Every structure is written in structure tokens, then in C-alpha cells.
Amino acid sequence: VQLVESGGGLVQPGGSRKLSCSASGFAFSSFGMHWVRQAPEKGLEWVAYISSGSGTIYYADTVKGRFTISRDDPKNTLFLQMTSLRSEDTAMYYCVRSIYYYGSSPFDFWGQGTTLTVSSGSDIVMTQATSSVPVTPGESVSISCRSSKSLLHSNGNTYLYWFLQRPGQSPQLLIYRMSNLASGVPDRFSGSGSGTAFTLTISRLEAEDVGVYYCMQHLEYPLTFGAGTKLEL
Amino acid sequence: ELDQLRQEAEQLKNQIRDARKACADATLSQITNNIDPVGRIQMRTRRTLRGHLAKIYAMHWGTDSRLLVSASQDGKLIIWDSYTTNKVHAIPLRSSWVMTCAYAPSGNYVACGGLDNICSIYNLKTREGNVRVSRELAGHTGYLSCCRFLDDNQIVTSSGDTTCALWDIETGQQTTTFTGHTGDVMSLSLAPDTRLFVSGACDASAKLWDVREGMCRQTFTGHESDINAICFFPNGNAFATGSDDATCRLFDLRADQELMTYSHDNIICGITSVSFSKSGRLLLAGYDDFNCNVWDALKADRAGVLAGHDNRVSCLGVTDDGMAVATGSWDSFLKIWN
Amino acid sequence: EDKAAVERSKMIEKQLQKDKQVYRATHRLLLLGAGESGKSTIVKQMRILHSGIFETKFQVDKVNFHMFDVGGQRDERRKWIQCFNDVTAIIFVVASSSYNTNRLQEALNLFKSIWNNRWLRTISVILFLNKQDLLAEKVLAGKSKIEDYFPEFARYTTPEDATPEPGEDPRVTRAKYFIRDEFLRISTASGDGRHYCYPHFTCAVDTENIRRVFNDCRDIIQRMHLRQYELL
Amino acid sequence: AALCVVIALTAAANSLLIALICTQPALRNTSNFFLVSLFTSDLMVGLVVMPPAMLNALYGRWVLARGLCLLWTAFDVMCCSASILNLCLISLDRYLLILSPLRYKLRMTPLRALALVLGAWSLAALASFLPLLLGWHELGHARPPVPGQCRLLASLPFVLVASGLTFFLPSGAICFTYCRILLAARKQAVQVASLTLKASLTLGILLGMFFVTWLPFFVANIVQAVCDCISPGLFDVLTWLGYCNSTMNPIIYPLFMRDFKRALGRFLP
Amino acid sequence: TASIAQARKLVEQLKMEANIDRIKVSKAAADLMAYCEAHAKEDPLLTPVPASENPFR
Ligand SMILES: NCCc1c[nH]c2ccc(O)cc12
């Protein structure tokens, strides 16, 4: 499984340059795809999404009217048309792979990311309180997050995702739907909580657990991430 | 020395028959006269799962009682979502004719087999997102009839070459074999404690085998024709057996004789699948009369008829919490009852 | 998140409805016979060459066909014959072991057990009487095995309704039609009229054996489609 | 009297038959969509066409809604033309299935069956709704209109081309199709009997009733077109016979196909 | 001869099947009666569970 992005560089404002994510190692036609960008000083935010088979297409509030996202299922290549690019659009764009059935694990794989730089010339908010936490290996630090409304749906499923963004690496998935652990993640992270308040508990922390931790809700669209909690040694 | 050996064998079944006749003090119909009966059981069709192209032969509930896998003779095996009538996976198969269908207790693997004598195991939770085959098993010379998962590494199978067999998923070889049947084995049922299973065949015999030891413990002979159906009671101390006599027979492991005959005069057609409830009071049996009868297991009376199928019910399955009964038939439909 | 699973279910049902028109446009043909019978010449001439079964997905006249031969099985064939209720035909291959227990008597009891089956009550049998070169090469040797091995051959004559080939010896015609009404006695001994028999005197290397099964399978679906509206 | 009992009979029979087909999963084939179109056609007859005719019959005149007489006449022409064309399509479906049964899935798709059903319904809708709303049905008419009573006035070239395209080409198609269906049935029974009659009775009934219900009525349409001096009451009895085809068809066509016969045994024991 | 060895295997199997300590029929019947009466509430097939707790309604 390998998602490689391309088509980035220096971009004049009002110009256009199309991103391209190449998919390899998996069947591309049965996976939903996302583009999630990250500011150089701020956290992650969601841009666009196409389901499998090009059925539905969703955008964000500051995204729609300008962009166009497209797929190519024989060529296994994502596309994202980028028109009327502004000075707030300088970000690192990740190619995100997800699947949706019952008991699935969406957002399991993330791309490496391409850098597009722009030169010069209702909704659910997620409040992560702690921005920097000074940790020690073995201290078993538990971090928490809050939501504006109850994420617990009528079918008994609550919608909260957890990520760990290492320095120089992609925000890999740890915990999906607040309780479940992802594949390849060791049994040190656990999450629990009500529909509004959430907590992610780490036990017996090592030196590979440093980074910024993020959330995501799937109560409805658009997808909001949150501030971020940085763990420092 | 065949003449002395056959006389010794006939004296041995005479000794077995005399020891079985000496240990029958009362009748199960006599001892269940203090039980208030359930009356009439009314079940309605909650979900009707459509989408199969041909005759559904086998089915198996998941252990979380929401996932469901069904097999059909068109050559494609469909993973179901029972609550929302969704299809999670649709697995194309190499051979068109599959007669068995199995689901792992962890939910990671699904095995199927048929007339090609190949037990193909399919990986559901792999990283690539598509259901691929794990490993084919190629040790039986007869047609596959039944298979149940023990672990994610072990699986026992029934086949039509008078032989049941355990298997190793990682190695690919037969760990032990079961070669005591004289007729074509059609079904097996696993114990809740998993170390025992009983398999009936076409010579009206059901043998209780030992999984760890590899030998046959008991021999149950009460039917008049073939056996197409076998199932264990919730506690694992008894099992009910369906056959082509239009008669279900309950056999107990401890007394090792026939307990109670479930039959009626109006039914002349054979039993294809049997399954118990969670309590063990209700015994549901498929038929070729295009319905399923709900037999009370302790009183042996018709407590209800699940009549919604337009063709012959091949397979029957009740959930692990006893919440729903799903019956699949030859009219390409699998209906989930109340 | 549930809506994308519903959309995935709609894609799986549209994939199933794509294969549904593939499935009902295909005619299913069951191949039955023995090792003495000629089926190593069917593998060279009716495109079997591109496991206990040997399926063959192949086409003639832009019509989908699908043949399936079950390999080495046991004598009690009553349990895997219930899986072939949806087929349109049964292709029966008989060799010629006569004028050369018995192989032909075992094939006759095999046709007796297959024809009087409960699950095959509405399914007809297309009959191939293969190895017709062996019913004329060993006639001139004069061993006379069909008189020793069959006592009904001396009271049998060539039928008046039969259509023989001219320029041929009449003992070869007697050796053909003795087995032809031997096999037709089991088919006309039932009297139900729901399913019939189609004998053919094929030889192993005959390139017309596909059109024979094409025309006879056309005759079976014409039987069903004319019985449906009470026209037969 | 019996004119509303026959309304309740054809409404209950056609609603039951539409329910039989649309609820039974075994009758979901493409050959029964033409019978479905015939069933909504004669159900539409039993709703909208016959009760204004018994309103004309019980009173002797039009007592209400005299402005909608052209709409009732156009719906009567559209309903009889849709019924005869739907019968022609069931005959053509039997032709495409019976004579070449290997090639039936290749040539007959449900898209092509829906295109043929929509083409026949649009051809009857066109040929009815054009000359009675745009007034093309009368040109050089010697028949005078009657005051206050409904007469569908029809000129002789209109009678010729409308009776031709409604009846006389489906009659030739039904005759040609059922003849060589009879020829295939006799050679079919010859190939059955010489190696190992009912169709003549079945399509003798299915051919003889249709023509008995219709042939006269169009003969009296021709006689009222070119000639004169016949009573309009006998024309009303022959129009009642042409209505009564929609009564005696649902009790006879299904009675002769096995699937429907079963479905009737399972639903109504 | 293979028939003598098959009869010897069947005779040894019948001696292994002959000496099984069996209990009475009424004791195992009362055990099945006691199980069935013990888990009677836990069965939603026996008692009609309403639609608040029924996942299929
Ligand atoms: N009841 C209307 C019968 C009918 C069908 N087509 C017609 C054409 C002309 C006419 O006068 C009458 C008809």
C-alpha cells in the first residue's frame, strides 16, 4: 500500500496547478478518497471527498465553488483541480484512503504529502484544550478532547477518530470510533468517554509516541479536526 | 477367519443393544408432563434479503449476530448485513457449486467448498480491501458437504468419501482423519466446548467423534434413511438429527440411545436443516413442504410453521443470542424471521 | 457513514444485476458417462481444453453454453444429483462394448437409475452412442458377442420407422438399433411424457456433435415453452 | 343492473391480477410485461370508459358533463386501440419466445420490451388524441349530429385509416403469428409422437373470441361510415361487445398459461 | 486378506464402543428439562420482545 502525491510547487495567486495522487498496492476502485491539508503553523483540515464509484462528492465551506476533485479508476490516480488559489491556501496536501462498511477501518492510510506554496502578489467545533504536554517515557499520560454536540448516533455508534502525527511523518490512525484499535497499532492506546467529552489514554509510553494528536467527527459533513496536543519529552 | 469375526461383531452389537435396553427407565415424553406448553409461536418475516442469482444451499450466522454469509449455486458468495439489509462483501468463487458455508468465530475468515473437492478459505480483513483466497485444501477425493471453524488455524470438514477430517490452515495438511463411516457424510455440528463433534451420514448413522483424540466415541442408529441434517443442543449433552423419514430424532450423548421422535402423519418429505433455540425449547426444522416447522423439543408438538418460502428450504440458522431465525431456500431468497 | 455503506450496497447490487443477465443467458449442460465411454475425444473437439469436476464455459452460434462433468464418484449418486435441478439437459455418453459384469449392462442400469430419479423428473437426457466405428470393425471378425451376451437380439428386427444409411451392411444397422431401442425402452417405459430422450450415433471424431446438442437443447426449451401455455 | 356488477368484477379481477404479478417474484420475467400493459389497459377501460356508457344507457342521454364528450370519445378510441395493440404485443412476444427460444435473451431485452410497450401506447395515444382534439375526424360528413347525446362522428377515410392501423394490421399479425405457431405445434407433436391438438383448441378459443368480440363492430363501423339506414342501438350493443372483451379476457388468457394458474392456486386455495 | 483386517478393525471398534458407562434416560431428560427451565427468560424466541429492544423492528 503506497500513496504518492505529485504536482506541487510555487504558485502565483490566481493561478492554477493540479495535484495528483498515485495509488499502488491496493484495489483503488473500492476505497473512498479524501484530501486533507495541513497549514505550516496550524493543524489539519478537510477539503474534499469522493465515494467509491464516483457516486457522491462533498466539499467544505471555504472549499466549494473553487475546487474540483476527480478520480481515475483504471489509471489508479486521484486528481484535484485547484483554481482561484489564495494566500490562505498554502498547505501540505495529503492523499487519504478510506473504506465504509460496517466494522470497517476508515482513514487507515495517509499519503506522504506534497507542498504547494502560494507567494505574495450548523457546524461542530472540536476544542482540544492542552496544546503542549511535557511527557516522560513511562508516565502514562492521558489526553482529552471536547465536542459541541453529542456524537453518539441513534444506532449506538459514536464517531471519533484519533491520529498521531510524528515529525516528518503522516498522521497515522490509532483509534477509530473511540474504542477500536487500528491494525498495526500496539495495545497502549485506549479511548473512552460520553457523547460530548472524550479522553485518549496512553499507558507505558515509549520514545516513538511523541507528536501531535488530532480528532475527527463523522456525525455529519464538513469534517473538522481540532487544535492539536503536542507531546514533548 | 471372517466367520468367527462376524459372529463376534454380532454378539458385540447384541451386547451394546442389551446395555442400551437396560438403561432406559423412563420416557422423555412421560417426564415432561409437568411442563406448561408454549402454545402457538407466531413469527413474522422482519428482513427479506434479496440479491442472490440462484438456489441458496448453505448459510452461517456470525458470532456477533449481525454479520451473515450465504452461498449459492451461481458461483458467488455474499456477506450480508442483517440489520440494515446491506451487502458488505460479494465474493466470486472459482467453482459454481458450493454446498457448505462457514464463518470464523473471530470473523476474519470464511470457508466454502463443494463438488470440486476444494475447501477454499477467504480472508476478509486483509489490508488491500478485496476478499482474496487464503489457501485451498486439496486432500478429499469426494464432494464437500459441511465445514465448521474451530479456531482461525483449525477447521474440521465433512465430505462424501466416507471421511471427515481436521485441517491446519497455516500448514495445509490433515492433522487427523475420521474414517469410521460407511455412507456419505452430509453434515456435522460442533459442541459449545469445541472438543467434540457429531456427524451423520447416508447409512442412518451418527458418530460422535473426538477432535483431540481422533477416534469415534459413540454410534447412534435410529433413522430409516439418509441423514441430511444434524445439530447440537445448547449445552452439548444432546443432539437432534434430521433425515428423509419426515422425522427428526433427538439423541442423548450420556445415555447413548434415542430420546424422542419428532414426527407427524401429514408430513412425508425429508428434513434438510435443523437448529435449536437459545433455551433449547424450540427446534426448527426445514422441509421440502416449502416451510419450516417449529417443534417443541420436550413435548413434540407443532408449535408453529414458518411459511414464507416459495421453494425448498435448504439451510436454517439461529443467532448466538437467539434473537432471529434466518431461513434460505431455493427461490434465491433468505428471509430473517422474528 | 451509513450512507456510504448503503451506496456500497447499491454498487454490489448493480454488480449482481450485471451478472444476473450473464447467469440467465447461459444454458447448463450436465455430462455423464464412464471411463469406457468416449470423453477423451470430447476434450479435443468440443473445446474443453482452454478438482473433482471439469467445467467448460464455451459458446456456439453466439449462445452461451456451460458443460459440467463430475469426475470419480461413488455408486450412490443420489445426493449430488440434487444440485443439477436447474440444468436444461443431461448429456449421456455410451460406448459400444458388443460384437467384440458387462459395460453396456452397467450403462443400461446407470441410465435406469438416472432416468427414474426424483430430482430429474423434468429434465431430459440427450443420449450419445459413441464409438460407432467399433460396431463395424469387429463385425467382420465374427466373434458374435451380442448374441452370446444378449438373448433378446435373436428376436429383434430392423424397424420400419427407422432411417438407416444406404450402402451399409444390415447387421451393422441391427447392432446400432438394438442398443438404440434398448436405451429407448427405459425412456418409453415411464409414460409420464414430461421428459424424453434424444439418441445419436456419434463416433469419437465427429465435428457435428456440438450442433446435435444445440438442436436437441433447442428442442427441450421448445418443449417447456410450449407446455407452459398448454400447447403440448 | 348487471352493468355495475361487471364493473366491480373487472375491477376486482384486474386489480387481483396486477397484484398477482407485481407481488409474485416468479412472474418477474420480460414476457409478462406485455400482459401487465394489457392489464393496466383493460383496468383503465373498467375505470374510465364503461361507466359513462352505462350513464348513457340508464338515462338515454348525457345528463352530466356534456363538454367532456370529446375526452370520453378520445379515451374510448385510445383504450380500444391500446387493448388491441397490447394483444398484438403479447402475440409478438409469444412469436419471439416460442419459435426461437435460444435467441430470446439476445433479442428481447426489458429495455426493448419497454420501448415496444411505450411505442404501442404512444401510437394509440397519437392516433386517438390527434383527430378528436384537433378536429381531424370529420371531413365531408353526411351524418348529422344529434342534440344532447353522444355520437362519435367519423368520416369514411378516418374510419378506413383508423380502423386499419388499430385493428386490421394487428389482426394480420396475430393470424400470421398464430398460424405458424400452429404449424410449429403440429410439427412439434409430429417430432414427439414419431420418436417417443391442444394448441388448436387453445388458440382457436384465443383467436375466435377476439374476432367475435371485434370483427362485427368494425364491420358495423364500415357500414355506418359508407352506407346508412341502420339503427344506432345495434351499434350500441356491438360497442358493448367491444367493451365486453375487457370482461372476458382476464378470465381466459391467464386460464391458459401454467404460471398464472399456479399463482392462483397458491394465493386463492 | 483385507476383509479379515477390516473385520478385526470393526471388532476392535465394537469393543471400544461396548464399554461405555451410561446413565439412565430419565436423569439426562431431567437435565435437559432443568436447562431448558433455567435459561427460559434469556430466550427472545419464546417470549415476544417488543420493538424497543428488538433490533429487527
Ligand atoms: N370504441 C372505440 C373503438 C375504435 C377503435 N378505433 C376506432 C377508430 C374509429 C372509430 O370510429 C372507432 C374506433
- Give the helix/strand (H/E) hosting B261: strand B257-263
Task: Please give the Cα distance from D220 to B154 (Å, whole number).
Answer: 84
Number of domains into which chain D is organized = 1
Q: Are B186 and B205 in contact (CB under 8 A)?
A: no
User: In 10 A of CB D41, how many CB atoms?
Assistant: 26
100-129 in chain B: CB under 8 A from chain A? 107, 125, 127-129
Any B CB within 8 A of D139 CB? no
Instruction: Kindly report the nearest CA distance between residue B334 and chain A, in angstroms.
Output: 20
In sequence order, the β-bridge partners of residue B252 are: B238, B257
E18, E28, E30 ranked by CB distance to B12: nearest:
E18
* B102/B61 Cα distance (integer angstroms): 9
Q: Do B333 and D25 touch (CB under 8 A)?
A: yes
* C-alpha torsion angle, residues D125, D131, D132, D133 (rounded to 10): 90
D81 lines ligand 1 (CB under 6 A): yes
Report the distance separating Cα B13 and Cα B223, nearest Å: 17
Q: In CATH, what class is A126-231?
A: mainly beta
Q: Judge contact between B244 and B228, C-beta under 8 A.
A: yes
Q: Which residues contact C226 (CB under 8 A, 6 or more apart)?
A: C232, D98, D184, D185, D188, D199
Please give the distance of CA C99 from its chain centroid, rounded to a whole number: 24
Q: Alpha-carbon dihedral of residues B5, B10, B15, B21, nearest 10 degrees? A: 170
Residue boundaries of the structural domains of chain E: 4-56
Handedness of CA D252, D255, D256, D260 (dihedral sign): positive
Give one word for B85, left, alpha or beta, with left for phi > 0 and alpha for psi -120 to 50.
left
CA distances from B27 to B15, B24, B206, D143, E27 (A): 22, 8, 21, 95, 10
| CA D73–ligand 1 middle distance (angstroms) | 9
Which among D151, D163, D210, D222 is the best mutation to test ligand 1's pocket, defined by most ligand atoms within 8 Å of the CB?
A: D163
Q: What is the CATH number of domain C27-227?
A: 3.40.50.300
What CATH number was assigned to the domain covering residues E4-56? 4.10.260.10
Nearest in space to B226 (alpha carbons), one of B206, B240, B212, B210: B206
Q: Sort out which chain C residues have CB atoms less than 8 A from D94's CB and list them.
A: 229
Residue D258 and residue D249: Cα distance in Å, rounded? 16
Method used to obtain the model:
cryo-EM
Inter-chain touch A51–C7, beta carbons under 8 Å: yes
The label of the residue with cell 353526411 reads D142
DSSP-derived secondary structure letter, D166 = I
Dist CA B126 CA B128 (whole Å):
6
Q: Which of B186, B194, B196 is nearest to B216 (CA)?
A: B196
3-state DSSP assignment of residue E2 = helix
Subunits with 3+ C-beta pairs closer than 8 A to A: B, C
Selecting from C12, C55, C70 the residue whose C-beta is nearest the C-beta of B96 gives: C55
**Close Cβ partners of E36 (under 8 Å, ≥ 6 residues apart):** B279, B280, B281, B297, B298
Q: Which residue of B has its CA nearest to D26?
A: B331
Does the C-beta of D83 come closer than 6 Å to ligand 1? Answer: no
Give the distance (Å) from ligand 1 centre to CA of residue D128: 9
Centroid of chain to Cα B56: 15
Listed by number, the residues of chain B in 51-110 with a beta carbon closer than 8 Å to a beta carbon of chain E are: 82-83
Q: Which chain C residue has its CA at the smallest distance from B57's CA?
A: C83
Atom of ligand 1 nearest to the CA of D77: 2
Which residue from E31, E43, E56 is facing B281, i.e. has the nearest CB?
E43
Grid coordinates standing for A70?
A: 476527480
Contact A113/A171 with Cβ under 8 angstroms? Answer: no
Answer whether E32 sits within 8 Å of B321, measured CB to CB: no
For the sheet with A189-193, list strands across it: A126-127, A142-147, A197-202, A189-193
Exposure of B123 in the CB half-sphere (CA atoms within 13 A): 14
Instruction: Give the DSSP letter of residue B311.
Output: S
C-alpha D217/C-alpha D234 separation (Å) is 10
Contact D144, D207 (CB under 8 A): no
Q: What's the rounded Cα separation, in Å, for the pair B198 and B182? A: 15
Q: Chain B contacts of D25, Cβ < 8 Å?
A: 310, 331, 333
Backbone angles phi, psi at A154, to 5 degrees: -75, -15
Q: For residue B191, give the C-alpha cell.
A: 459442541
Task: Mutate one of D28, D195, D201, D256 to test the C interface: name it (highest C CB count within 10 A).
Answer: D195
User: Is D76 within any annotated ligand binding site?
Assistant: yes
On whether any CB of chain D is under 8 Å from the CB of B310, the answer is yes
Taking the alpha carbons at both ends of chain E, their separation in whole angstroms is 66
- Listed by start position, the domains of chain A span 2-118, 126-231
C-alpha to C-alpha distance for A157 and A102, rounded to whole angstroms: 10
What distance in Å separates residue C22's CA from the closest CA in chain A? 22
In whole angstroms, give the CA distance from residue A59 to residue D60.
69
Q: Which residue minimizes the CA distance to atom 6 of ligand 1?
A: D77
3-state secondary structure of B156: strand
Q: Mind listing the domains of chain B with CATH numbers?
A: 2-337 (2.130.10.10)
Q: Which residues contact A199 (CB under 8 A, 6 or more apart)?
A: A142, A143, A144, A145, A191, A192, A193
On the 0-12 / 13-18 / 19+ scale of CB atoms within 10 A, A46 is buried
The partner residue sitting opposite E22, judged by closest CB among B19, B233, B318, is: B19
Query: Mutation test of the interface with chain B: which of E26, E35, E36, E57, choosing the one with the most B Cβ atoms within 10 A?
Result: E36
Residue with CA nearest ligand 1 atom 13: D77
Joined together, the cell numbers standing for residue A76 give 489508479
Are B232 and B198 spatial neighbours (Cβ–Cβ below 8 Å)? yes
Look at chain A and count its residues.
233
Q: What is the distance between the alpha carbons of residues B284 and B303, in angstroms, rounded to a whole number?
A: 10
Q: Is D154 near ligand 1, meaning CB less than 6 Å away?
A: yes
Instruction: Identify the three-state secondary structure at position D33.
Output: helix
Q: For A2-118, CATH number?
A: 2.60.40.10
Quote the cell numbers at residue B212: 483431540
Phi/psi for A194 (5° steps) reads: -90, -165
Q: Does the beta-carbon distance from D26 to B333 stay under 8 Å?
A: no
Say if ligand 1 is within 6 A of residue D162 CB.
yes
The three three-digit cell numbers of residue B155, written as one number: 477447521
As a whole number of angstroms, the distance between CA A103 and CA B163 comes to: 37
CB atoms within 10 A of CB D214: 22
Q: Which helix (H) or strand (E) holds D19?
A: helix D2-23
- Please, what's the b/e burial string for B296-310 (b: 16 or more CB within 10 A of its CB; e: otherwise)? bbbbbeebbebebbe
Chains B and E form CB pairs within 8 A to the count of 150
Q: Is the CB of E32 less than 8 angstroms away from the CB of B233?
A: yes
Q: Which three cell numbers stand for residue B250?
A: 433427538
- DSSP β-ladder status, A229-232 and A132-134: parallel
Lookup: cell for D148: 344532447
CA of D172 from ligand 1 middle (Å) equals: 18
Chain D: partners with 3+ C-beta pairs within 8 Å = B, C
Helix (H, G, I), strand (E, B) or coil at B12: helix
A61 at C interface, C-beta within 8 A: no
D140: amino acid identity, one letter = G
Whole-angstrom Cα distance, residue D208 to residue D203?
A: 8
Q: Which of B78, B84, B115 sits opposite C53 (nearest CB)?
A: B115
Cα separation, E45 vs B323, in Å, equals: 7
State the Cα–Cα distance between residues D261 and C227, nearest whole angstrom.
13
Which residues are bridge partners to B199 per DSSP?
B188, B207
Interface probe for B, chosen from A31, A52, A102, A107 (most Cβ of B below 10 Å), is A102
Question: Is any atom of ligand 1 closer than 6 Å to the C-beta of D213?
Answer: no
**Pocket perturbation via mutation, ligand 1, pick of D49, D78, D81 by most ligand atoms within 8 A of CB:** D81
Taking the C-alpha atoms of residue E41 and residue E53, their distance in angstroms, rounded to an integer, is 14
**CA–CA dist A108, A89 (Å, integer):** 25
Distances (CA, A) of D99 to A190, C218, D102, D173, D188: 70, 10, 9, 15, 11
Measured CA to CA, the distance from residue D34 to residue D75 in angstroms comes to: 20
Is there a contact between B338 and B42 (Cβ–Cβ < 8 Å)?
yes
**A218 vs C contacts (CB less than 8 Å):** 1
DSSP chain A: -EEEEE--SEE-TT----EEEEEESS-GGGSEEEEEEE-SSS-EEEEEEE-TTS--EEE-TTTTTTEEEEEETTTTEEEEEE-S--GGG-EEEEEEEE--STT--TT-EE---EEEEE-------EE---SEEE--TTS--EEEEEESS--B-TTS-B-BEEEEE-TTS-EEEEEETTTEEPTT--TTEEEEE-SSEEEEEE-S--TT--SEEE--B-SSSSP-----EEEE-
- The three-state secondary structure class of C42 is helix
Residues D27, D8: Cα–Cα separation, whole Å: 25
Contact call for residues A11 and A117 (beta carbons, < 8 A): yes
Q: Do C1 and A102 touch (CB under 8 A)?
A: no
Strand (E) or helix (H) holding B158: strand B154-159
Please report the resolution in angstroms: 3.0
Chains B and A touch (3+ CB pairs under 8 A): yes
Point out which residues pair with B196 in neighbouring strands.
B210
* Chain B partners (3+ C-beta pairs within 8 A): A, C, D, E
B280 touches chain E (CB under 8 A): yes
The answer to whether the beta carbons of residues D71 and D65 sit under 8 Å apart is no
The number of C-alpha atoms within 13 Å of D42 and in the hemisphere containing its C-beta is 34
**Containing domain of residue D2, as a range?**
1-267
Please tell me if the domain spanning A2-118 has the same topology as the one spanning A126-231: yes
Extract the C-alpha cell encoding A175: 483509534
Chain D closest CA to B331's CA: distance in Å?
8
* Amino acid identity at B10: E
Give the CATH number, domain containing residue D180: 1.20.1070.10
Contacts for C156-165 with beta carbons within 8 Å, 24 or more apart?
A: C156/C181, C161/D194
Are A198 and A145 in contact by the 8 Å Cβ rule? The answer is yes
Q: How many CB atoms lie within 10 A of CB E24?
A: 15
Distance separating alpha carbons of residues C43 and D224, to the nearest angstrom: 72
Place of cell 515509549: A206
Q: How far is the CA of C163 from the centre of ligand 1 (A)?
A: 56
| Cβ(D166) – ligand 1 distance below 6 Å | yes
Cα–Cα distance measured from residue A148 to residue A127, given in angstroms and rounded to the nearest whole number? 8
Residue in this structure with the C-alpha cell 371531413, named with its chain if needed: D139
Other C-beta atoms closer than 10 Å to the C-beta of E1 total 8
Cell numbers describing residue D246: 375487457
CB atoms within 10 A of CB B39: 10
Rg (CA), chain D: 20
Give the whole-angstrom CA distance, residue D151 versus residue D157. 18
Q: Which of A154, A157, A149, A163 is nearest to A197 (CA)?
A: A149
Angstrom distance (rounded) from CA D181 to CA D167? 20
Q: Which residues of C touch D102 (CB under 8 A)?
A: 27, 61, 63, 214, 217-218, 221
Best of B52, B310, B330, B332 to disrupt the D interface (most D CBs within 10 Å) is B310
